[PDB]
Amino acid sequence: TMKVINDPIHGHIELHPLLVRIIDTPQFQRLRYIKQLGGGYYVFPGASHNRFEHSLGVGYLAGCLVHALGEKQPELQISERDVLCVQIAGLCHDLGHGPFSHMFDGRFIPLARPEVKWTHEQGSVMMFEHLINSNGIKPVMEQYGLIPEEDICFIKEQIVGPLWPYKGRPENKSFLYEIVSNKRNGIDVDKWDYFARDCHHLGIQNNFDYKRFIKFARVCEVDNELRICARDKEVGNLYDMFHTRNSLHRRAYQHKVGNIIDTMITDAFLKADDYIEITGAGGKKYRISTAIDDMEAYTKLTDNIFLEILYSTDPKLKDAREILKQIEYRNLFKYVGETQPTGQIKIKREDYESLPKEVASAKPKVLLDVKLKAEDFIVDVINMDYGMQEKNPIDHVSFYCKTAPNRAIRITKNQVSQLLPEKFAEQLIRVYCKKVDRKSLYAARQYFVQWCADRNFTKPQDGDVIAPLITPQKKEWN
Amino acid sequence: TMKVINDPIHGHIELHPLLVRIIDTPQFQRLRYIKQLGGGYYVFPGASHNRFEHSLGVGYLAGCLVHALGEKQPELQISERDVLCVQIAGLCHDLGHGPFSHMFDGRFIPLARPEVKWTHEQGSVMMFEHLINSNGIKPVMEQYGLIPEEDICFIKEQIVGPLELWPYKGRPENKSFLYEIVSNKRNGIDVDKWDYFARDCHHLGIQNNFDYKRFIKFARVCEVDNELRICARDKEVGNLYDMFHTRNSLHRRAYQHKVGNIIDTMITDAFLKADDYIEITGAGGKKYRISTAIDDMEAYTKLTDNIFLEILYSTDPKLKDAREILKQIEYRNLFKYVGETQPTGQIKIKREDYESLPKEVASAKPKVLLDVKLKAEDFIVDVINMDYGMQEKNPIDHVSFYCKTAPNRAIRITKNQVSQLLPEKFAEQLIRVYCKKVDRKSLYAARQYFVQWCADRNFTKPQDGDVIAPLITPQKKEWN
Amino acid sequence: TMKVINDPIHGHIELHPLLVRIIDTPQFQRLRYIKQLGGGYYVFPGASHNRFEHSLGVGYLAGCLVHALGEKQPELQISERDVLCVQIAGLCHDLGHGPFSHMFDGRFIPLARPEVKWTHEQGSVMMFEHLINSNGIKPVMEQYGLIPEEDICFIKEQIVGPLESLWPYKGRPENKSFLYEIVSNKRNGIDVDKWDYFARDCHHLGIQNNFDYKRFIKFARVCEVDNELRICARDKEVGNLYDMFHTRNSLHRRAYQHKVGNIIDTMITDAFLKADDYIEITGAGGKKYRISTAIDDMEAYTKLTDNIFLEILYSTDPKLKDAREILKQIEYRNLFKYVGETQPTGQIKIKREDYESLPKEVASAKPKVLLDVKLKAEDFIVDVINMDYGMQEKNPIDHVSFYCKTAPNRAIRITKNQVSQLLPEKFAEQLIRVYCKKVDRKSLYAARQYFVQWCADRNFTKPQDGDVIAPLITPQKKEWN
Amino acid sequence: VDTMKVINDPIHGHIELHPLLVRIIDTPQFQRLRYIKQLGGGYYVFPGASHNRFEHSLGVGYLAGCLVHALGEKQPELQISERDVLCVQIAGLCHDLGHGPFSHMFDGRFIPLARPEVKWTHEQGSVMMFEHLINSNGIKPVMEQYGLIPEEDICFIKEQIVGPLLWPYKGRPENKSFLYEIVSNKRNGIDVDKWDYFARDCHHLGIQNNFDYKRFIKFARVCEVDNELRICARDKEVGNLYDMFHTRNSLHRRAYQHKVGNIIDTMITDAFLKADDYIEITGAGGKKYRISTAIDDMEAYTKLTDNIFLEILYSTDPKLKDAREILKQIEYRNLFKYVGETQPTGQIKIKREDYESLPKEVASAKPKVLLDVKLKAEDFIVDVINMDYGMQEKNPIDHVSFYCKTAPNRAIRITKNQVSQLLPEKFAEQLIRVYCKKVDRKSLYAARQYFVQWCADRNFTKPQDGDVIAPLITPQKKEWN
Ligand SMILES: Nc1nc2c(ncn2[C@@H]2O[C@H](COP(=O)(O)OP(=O)(O)OP(=O)(O)O)[C@@H](O)[C@H]2O)c(=O)[nH]1
Ligand SMILES: Nc1ncnc2c1ncn2[C@H]1C[C@H](O)[C@@H](COP(=O)(O)OP(=O)(O)OP(=O)(O)O)O1
Ligand SMILES: Nc1ncnc2c1ncn2[C@H]1C[C@H](O)[C@@H](COP(=O)(O)OP(=O)(O)OP(=O)(O)O)O1
Ligand SMILES: Nc1ncnc2c1ncn2[C@H]1C[C@H](O)[C@@H](COP(=O)(O)OP(=O)(O)OP(=O)(O)O)O1
Ligand SMILES: [Fe+3]
Ligand SMILES: [Fe+3]
Ligand SMILES: [Fe+3]
Ligand SMILES: [Mg+2]
Ligand SMILES: [Mg+2]
Ligand SMILES: [Mg+2]
């Protein structure tokens, strides 16, 4: 029956038998072989951690929050059925991540198959369905009081989202949808686990207290719908939650070398895509890019693929294997510099393909010893936000006061502090050069710093040093 | 000989015999009986920690940074004499804190003796001098290669800045970086912060966002304007904005906690009422009061958090007024918090006007029926400045950076060059209002007066304002 | 109303209003001014922590364990009344500690008033009674469903055990005997008091803690043992329980009984003894009490805390000059000097009656070495320290009950043989430290010779450093070669 | 041009890697350790324990540097050069280069079963793989560039790892013998390898670590013992050293030898054995090697990691179906069932020669009620596990040298008597776990009866759960009542 398991982040947690049964399936255990931070392990040697253990922790925390809301407010009529369903959603929320997590849905699939709109979330829904059907879970759900028709829908809806649009639960339990993946503002237990866990393994202490948020969480009526509200005074801690997030993106998740290793692995997958077969349903053969179309195949597609390519001897894989071998020897593409747009210029995702052409096109006003072609440059554009593009997510949180804990309210940015961020979204543009040698790298720097001046981008931090002859050209930089 | 000591923050640290000798003196051991966070212990029950152990840690970290700079750059010619002097400064930097730390220099002395400009730092210099002279330290300094004339000046200068072109008499310009270790006047990045971040977090029950050890690995001395200064690596600029964010965050959560501060004001209140009647024997047997002990260091040595309990346990009828306040803190009959607000636009509230603000709150005429009128002496208004340690200025604009490709060439990094998600301003005010009358009827009235006062002075709407004063918040068009 | 409070060990904990009301009283807030580890702060500069915050944490953990037992086993019929009572006991379990905690009941009172048998626990009962009566708590207890007649008895009984075979407790019946094993476990010593201090003392000391209380709670269960419902642990956890008591003994060796920590304790105690006659503390009806007699009146004892140290230190009364001088020697670090450590051999316990006589014995030893300086008995301090697993000579795991996976209601026993050959052979020993009150180089050498000879004379273990400190004496003993 | 590199380890913080070390690190032979898990199958029981050999290897390298560097500051007379330091760091960094798939499963279970004729250790592999790393990545010129002498130093590095290829070492003279006690201490076992894994395994396992390496370093010192300079610890630290080995044994009991962790190890090993014949790995000159023979060629062994598990799991070849089915049973958690644990009594060791025979013995037991289901010997797994203080039956503290405060160059010994009566009596024992390959309710009951009888038959300790699982058998033994 109930099973205790020792997580270093959360301690000894209990898993209800139904959860154990879901956990002990190929579709779930698959997450033991997919790293949380993708290529980040190749920069932060602590970050060996995989999706499996994150997935357990999200499940656990989903349980804590829903269970706590129920103790504090019986009127909500949260059943142990609701609790199990929320735990299951949490547990299975990342079932559909690919090899190297965010590299797969974020870099690889968009390049290998531009026609498809595919997300790790959609994969989770599909893989959940596959897990359920192939391991006879529906009878076991019934055994512990679930109703598979309704509840499987509710679980899927928690993961990917949908008058009242949800078919899984009624409006009087809309708060249950704000636990595992919060579409309204982003404050969800997924974040809370990864903050704590990624910090543990990364070697960074975490600024944020989930346990305290749970103690000051409460359900109130907002616009004819019951939602999770936080206490008025906690507004500060919530701005700090999203700061913590952006901070972890800057330090670790978007680390300039972590990302170049990601682009190199992605590059290697693209060159191996044609030649690697993965057996799926009915014995049909799938490629790495097409395994997402069949979940029995996708079950077998993990970080393994990296080592399968690396260890191979097939001459068809030589191109892909050479890239991965350059990662072993640490002949990585070289970082040239970082820059941002100015004013209110967003760079459209359509234009990313075109940017290397632009860097090589720049004509710096001294004659150059080495010309470099566009295919020598990589430009990587990265969006940093508070999880809702240009919007302040705290403008989409509801609060309560000590003196009236059932009355929800709003808190604007003025009402909190003048020292908060002015905008909530920006872009970072990193430029790397594929040619490693001393002469090419100098040239690349000159092209880059000029390109920055040409497009009225911010001056590179190191710009005066790396390109001392170019930085006086721009009046705006002096 | 050398002594090893086990600090929970820093681990096993070595104390050079000279340091041990300074440590084992009444003037230093005094810091065992002064709490770091003052009244904060009465809100965060972890925060029992005292200045003693902070003082050791600052000393230790001062040593780490100067010692590391020396390994990485021999050309700087940092002597073991320089290292000891920097450690000593770090160790003794907080020697002059009063009872309840920041309550003393921050609330009490300014009220008891408005004529004096007195800082905890100035006290540290005076108390250092007293420690040296009364415990025969000068011969021991000489024994380990120091030159007391020069070095005592250098130590004092590290603590309070220049005692009177190059302003320092303690060291030459080619060692100006040594002045940026214990107390950094240029930008505020000093080892004092680094210890208290880690230590206060440990005891408070808050995890700390900031890695001092990493800063030390990417620290370096370079020439800036004919003067050798500590520079950080270009890419670390992000972590430095995050250092000051961490600081402001700890002020909001803990150091300026609304009840922590009201306990501070109540203790301060009790000291003021006991000031006339408590005698402290100083030099030559002269009798000093709590407010005047700062004028004589032998007296000040005996002035610690003890004073709280001396007042509490006393039986003298002259202390009954003061003792009653402290007894109300035991029973938890604290002054009640009404709400918080801020100015709008760019209106600073001058420190001269703080005395006048309770008069203003009671003066407000809210269009609500009230049973109970409240007089100005019933209100406490507390104005709190939150900044990045340099009033309105961005301290990162006063940091120097180096690049990987040229590690001796210093540069500057502007705010644009880093991120759009950084703060717009670097200084603000918080205005808390409390009410001395505790009952249900007075507290309601106080809320109405307060929320109206906010509307009257075009301050921000209190977060809870619609709930606590529902009849007043529609009056302001700007809030709808 | 309910109150959330942030402890660095346990996180955000909730305090029921009744608890808040008990907490916000002079008798309880007094614990803010008494240090957990006494003199240990003067050796481990992290250990500033006071009884107040320990007391909260014990209260909290008492709540967790009783609350968990209730979720896992409804049949036990644990009421929210039971829970509050257990929390209150936990919260108030250390109400009666004196200045510098264990120094007071352990060194000072036994010396100042040898006629009395007084424990910190008995004090807790008295001070609880005083807290209740002086702050009108009884109506508030009733308000939240307690029955003060029964429950105040139950609370006191948790703290000190039975107030007067049959069932000895008047506070609860036999079908709830497990409630008595939460705050202070007379059966085996596995209680939530230990669990808080392990974690907390480690946090502040700078030592990581080997023991997981949370795991014990997950594998705890109530079963019938000899017509009485007790807390049982899972069979496989037996290893972790031997490791709990090892952790405890380890913390005693490293920190609580640290050779200098203890000498600072003896010096403070010494100073209190010399100031005892001349310090007045006002009690009930204005009667004046001395430090040693404040334990007889709880209104006086309320005002007796670590303050007393500083009151003595800062004083100018010529009657206190003797006491003040000792405390001033602690500031300057002119501490009594450690000579060495030793143990008895075989199965010889040293009776507590004989402790007074041991300094006389050390000076009496006639070492065959030339000495400049004879030392009198009053120059030596001998400190005898018992190290055990909390139950004198007994193995406390022999007094634990266990359950198996296959039958979780059937209790069993586990012997020492059944666990491991690498466990301790005995569960109690003595340590004998000798210090010398004369500090100079010549006296310290002499003291070493007297000591190492005394060890040989009484067939004690050879001091670790013995060949170095007394090279001329160690060949005399055939048993050491 | 090539420069120092900073890297952020969660255990040790920001550590500096000298360019020579970076160059060794950035090679296929070293990066291979990213794909080998520290605790083997332990990840399948402690979901925190994802950590691999790579990051341990860095940390050992780092700590090797700290200890040697510290000894040099405190005692210049030893004349420790930056050349010595680099060599010690390199040894530390490369000490585990030769671990196989699932770390200790490979050298401990698999190879002994697949190839009983060979004596092969993970250490020997480290030496071979170090040689291969050096030669294939042109390291010798780079060593010279930073002042090493490859002839001498490569020998010294290898000798640190496996011991010696009168004074047996050719790598350094007797006046630097202490350098051999840093990465892998043959004398007593106190080495920086332990110190890293204690801290690291604890971090990831969810257990706090009882032991302070940093403190040991502050109280470490080199002294002359028997015409040879060795690392000595301070007299008073002897307690902490007994606690180091206790910590170690404690981590073995809780985690490394966890009853299910070990059964997953035996199942993976089982699957490798069934796949051994059919999986090819390309080595030097394109020769094909099997999993068991990859140890004979280091270019092949470079490609042999935990991958092999997934290669078997994902495969479609019908020749691998047997092996793949075992691994699939680990996914679904149809593990072999644990029956119970027991130990020998008196001083009876079970010889390693007799391990093959023990399943035969369990099935042979004739319990005095007739059994409905008979079980054959191949249905039982008996796993015998030695728990010690790292030196079989010996106390490693008897092989430590100590110094006193009063004479810090004079080494001494400290016996067990001189420390504590509460220390272990013996320093080595055996654990015998029995599992059953048949999972069903009827077979498991039978297995329990066979097992508990076998315990009685061989005069082993009574299983903790024995009264419950086999209530009809436990009264038969007079010794158990
Ligand atoms: N079942 C399961 N357990 C895991 C997993 N990861 C870690 N564990 C821990 O592994 C422990 C041992 O596994 P169990 O499956 O209980 O194996 P067992 O104890 O032989 O089988 P039971 O009789 O059912 O307890 C559990 O108690 C868990 O805490 C996992 O993926 N599945
Ligand atoms: N076992 C321990 N583990 C961790 N810290 C300890 C331990 N024992 C003592 N400490 C602490 C207390 C001190 O702050 C610091 C040094 O104490 P300790 O090593 O006992 O030196 P000491 O100065 O009393 O001995 P000596 O004078 O004999 O050199 O470490
Ligand atoms: N942001 C924070 N992070 C962590 N701990 C905090 C924070 N703010 C306060 N604490 C600690 C201090 C106290 O121990 C406990 C409660 O603080 P707080 O909730 O503000 O109490 P309070 O009595 O001021 O709230 P209330 O507004 O209900 O009266 O938590
Ligand atoms: N902001 C940070 N806080 C903590 N750790 C960090 C941070 N940034 C990076 N790390 C970790 C990852 C690596 O192990 C180590 C080195 O990171 P980084 O210093 O950015 O190396 P790098 O090689 O990218 O820099 P460079 O090429 O500029 O020398 O620090
Ligand atoms: Fe997630
Ligand atoms: Fe206690
Ligand atoms: Fe190792
Ligand atoms: Mg997701
Ligand atoms: Mg007690
Ligand atoms: Mg090894």
Side-chain angles (χ1 to χ4, degrees), chain C residues 263-276:
Chain C
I263 210 64
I264 288 171
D265 281 346
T266 63
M267 286 177 78
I268 290 171
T269 286
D270 216 337
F272 285 15
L273 288 162
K274 295 207 169 72
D276 191 29

Side-chain angles (χ1 to χ4, degrees), chain B residues 5-6 8 24-26 29 32-33 41-42 44-46 48-50 52-53 56 135 202-205 301-302 304 306 308-309 313 315 330-332, chain C residues 5-6 8 24-26 29 32-33 41-42 45-46 48-50 52-53 56 135 203-206 282 302 305 307 309-310 314 316 331-333:
Chain B
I5 187 166
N6 191 3
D24 289 330
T25 63
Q29 298 274 301
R32 285 170 181 281
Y33 322 106
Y41 178 46
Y42 298 92
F44 292 86
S48 55
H49 67 298
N50 308 293
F52 180 75
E53 53 257 51
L56 293 181
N135 302 290
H202 185 74
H203 293 87
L204 283 166
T301 304
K302 305 198 280 158
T304 69
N306 192 55
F308 178 95
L309 294 177
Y313 299 158
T315 55
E330 290 218 303
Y331 293 106
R332 211 79 182 180
Chain C
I5 187 165
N6 190 4
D24 289 331
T25 62
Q29 298 274 301
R32 284 170 181 282
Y33 322 105
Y41 178 46
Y42 298 92
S48 56
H49 66 299
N50 308 293
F52 180 75
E53 53 257 50
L56 293 179
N135 302 290
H203 185 74
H204 293 87
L205 283 166
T282 308
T302 304
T305 69
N307 191 242
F309 177 96
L310 291 183
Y314 299 157
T316 54
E331 292 218 295
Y332 293 107
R333 211 78 181 179

Side-chain angles (χ1 to χ4, degrees), chain D residues 220-286 288-289 291-318 320 322-346 348 350 353-355 357-359 361-367 369-373 375 377-440 443-455:
Chain D
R221 221 185 139 72
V222 179
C223 308
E224 182 148 334
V225 199
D226 310 332
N227 312 335
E228 181 179 346
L229 292 180
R230 298 179 204 167
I231 292 168
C232 308
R234 229 204 109 175
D235 52 348
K236 93 197 179 203
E237 302 305 278
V238 67
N240 296 334
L241 294 180
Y242 278 99
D243 286 1
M244 197 199 76
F245 291 99
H246 179 104
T247 283
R248 182 164 167 282
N249 190 68
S250 171
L251 290 164
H252 274 269
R253 276 216 180 244
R254 293 181 179 166
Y256 313 143
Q257 302 303 141
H258 183 267
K259 62 182 198 291
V260 182
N262 284 186
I263 210 64
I264 288 171
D265 281 346
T266 64
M267 285 177 76
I268 290 172
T269 286
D270 216 336
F272 285 15
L273 288 162
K274 295 211 173 64
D276 191 31
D277 293 0
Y278 317 98
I279 279 180
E280 293 154 334
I281 307 162
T282 311
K288 287 139 154 240
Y289 294 87
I291 299 166
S292 52
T293 59
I295 64 187
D296 301 333
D297 173 48
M298 290 296 106
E299 192 177 321
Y301 198 51
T302 304
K303 306 201 290 211
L304 179 65
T305 70
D306 292 2
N307 190 55
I308 213 81
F309 178 95
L310 293 180
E311 192 187 331
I312 291 162
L313 185 67
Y314 300 158
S315 60
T316 55
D317 193 318
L320 296 161
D322 272 37
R324 181 164 59 260
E325 272 300 320
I326 292 177
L327 296 194
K328 255 162 102 96
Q329 295 314 289
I330 298 171
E331 290 211 301
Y332 293 109
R333 210 78 180 182
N334 292 325
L335 308 187
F336 301 150
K337 293 285 151 135
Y338 167 75
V339 179
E341 181 161 23
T342 189
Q343 288 182 248
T345 57
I348 314 162
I350 292 183
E353 50 189 5
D354 301 322
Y355 290 9
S357 85
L358 297 182
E361 291 182 17
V362 175
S364 297
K366 312 278 185 236
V369 165
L370 251 283
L371 290 178
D372 16 41
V373 188
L375 286 175
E378 64 226 303
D379 299 317
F380 289 106
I381 289 165
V382 180
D383 195 19
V384 182
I385 289 156
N386 300 309
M387 309 286 281
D388 54 17
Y389 274 28
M391 288 180 76
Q392 301 74 40
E393 291 152 296
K394 306 175 205 193
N395 179 346
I397 304 310
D398 290 333
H399 300 254
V400 175
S401 276
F402 299 93
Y403 69 92
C404 312
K405 187 167 64 160
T406 40
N409 292 321
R410 194 177 141 200
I412 52 163
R413 300 281 173 180
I414 306 177
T415 70
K416 213 188 77 167
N417 306 329
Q418 285 185 283
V419 192
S420 173
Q421 312 300 303
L422 317 182
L423 293 168
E425 188 146 38
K426 304 171 170 152
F427 297 90
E429 61 183 345
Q430 275 168 312
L431 293 171
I432 303 156
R433 274 78 170 279
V434 176
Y435 311 75
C436 180
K437 288 178 169 189
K438 299 208 162 149
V439 180
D440 63 298
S443 304
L444 192 46
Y445 174 82
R448 282 156 178 171
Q449 307 318 288
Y450 285 119
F451 168 62
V452 174
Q453 188 59 65
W454 181 65
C455 293

Side-chain angles (χ1 to χ4, degrees), chain B residues 274 317 447:
Chain B
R447 281 156 177 175

Side-chain angles (χ1 to χ4, degrees), chain A residues 207 209 212 216 231-234 236-237 240 402, chain B residues 40-46 204-206 249 252-254 257-260 332 337, chain C residues 1-7 11-13:
Chain A
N207 197 232
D209 197 341
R212 187 182 164 88
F216 293 113
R231 229 205 110 171
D232 52 348
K233 93 193 171 207
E234 302 306 277
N237 297 335
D240 285 2
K402 189 168 64 158
Chain B
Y41 178 46
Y42 298 92
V43 172
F44 292 86
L204 283 166
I206 293 163
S249 171
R252 276 216 180 243
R253 293 181 179 166
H257 183 266
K258 63 183 198 285
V259 183
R332 211 79 182 180
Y337 167 76
Chain C
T1 51
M2 190 265 331
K3 212 142 273 215
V4 183
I5 187 165
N6 190 4
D7 188 73
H12 289 68
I13 70 192

Side-chain angles (χ1 to χ4, degrees), chain D residues 95-96 122-123:
Chain D
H95 85 287
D96 278 338
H122 78 270
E123 290 97 359

